[PDB]
């Protein structure tokens, strides 16, 4: 059962696995179904763009916080700063998320600009029903794409103050490690 110089393998097939095998024979069929469903939904919703406008947010975690992506919806504060109510925003094609909060001025200002540009690029048909026939744009994300914010200029002058970056990192670790013991010794005295 164990022979030769081979890696240790862990193949989890000791249950009735053959009863739960899923082969995606309908991969091509489902692609046709999704394309048909998108086409019939676009014809149903008039010239509406088939998707709602989304804000730009910072991804969490230290690993992914260097990038911005699309969030669920604009906050109540962002909607209010744009000059309209949340209820009217939902009926006009804007996603609203009540549980997200604003703590960064850069993110808040950018989402305010997105709402203002969106309002100036759409036409809202009156409730009377005359309904002038306008061409349908199938995507709002492509019309309003998300770009990573600029960080630094291409070239700049060298400014060295004589300090050491390695020394700065080492001292930062040391201060955090011994903060508790230093306070106790100071308090006991």
């Amino acid at each position: 059962a164990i022979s030769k110089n081979l890696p240790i393998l862990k193949n989890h097939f000791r249950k009735h696995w053959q009863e739960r095998v899923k082969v995606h024979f309908d991969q091509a069929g489902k692609k046709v179904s999704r394309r048909n469903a998108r086409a019939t939904r676009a014809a149903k919703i008039a010239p509406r763009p088939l998707d709602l406008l989304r804000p730009v947010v910072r991804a969490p975690t230290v690993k992914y916080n260097r990038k911005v992506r699309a969030g669920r919806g604009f906050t109540l504060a962002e909607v209010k700063a744009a000059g309209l109510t949340a209820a009217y925003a939902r009926t006009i094609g804007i996603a609203v998320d009540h549980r997200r909060q604003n703590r960064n001025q850069e993110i808040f200002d950018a989402n305010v600009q997105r709402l203002k540009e969106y309002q100036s690029k759409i036409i809202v048909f009156p409730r009377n029903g005359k309904a002038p026939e306008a061409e349908q744009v199938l995507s709002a994300a492509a019309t309003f794409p998300i770009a990573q914010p600029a960080t630094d200029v291409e070239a700049r002058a060298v400014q060295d103050n004589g300090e050491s970056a390695f020394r700065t990192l080492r001292l930062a670790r040391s201060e955090k490690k011994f903060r508790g013991i230093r306070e106790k010794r100071a308090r006991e005295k």
Binding site: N65, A77, Q101, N102, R103, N104, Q105, E106, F108, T168, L169, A172, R173, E175, K176, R179
Partner: protein, 99 residues
């Protein structure tokens, strides 16, 4: 509460322009109201005291408040709940026969 701008240390992290979000009303869920205070005070006078609360009052008078917390921890769950219960009994003792 300003970040240092480096990857390690006490206040590590990037420095951004800060904003103060509006307070959420859900953060005040366990806040006493005038109507709620009135009902609870009236109910205490009507219903009276629980049997385990009666013996806790005796222990406070006869064996001090330290042994009362040990018993109150047993009847209740956590020790932090025993602290609050013994505190309430002391206020009852002050307003029952002391004054």
């Amino acid at each position: 509460t300003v970040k240092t701008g480096i990857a390690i240390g006490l206040n590590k992290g990037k420095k951004v322009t800060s904003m103060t979000p509006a307070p959420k009303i859900s953060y005040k869920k366990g806040a006493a109201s005038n109507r709620t205070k009135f009902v609870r005070s009236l109910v205490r006078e009507i219903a009276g005291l629980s049997p385990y609360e009666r013996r806790l009052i005796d222990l406070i008078r006869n064996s001090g408040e330290k042994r009362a917390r040990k018993v109150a921890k047993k009847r209740l769950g956590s020790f932090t709940r025993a602290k609050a219960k013994v505190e309430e009994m002391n206020n009852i003792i002050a307003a029952s026969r002391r004054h």
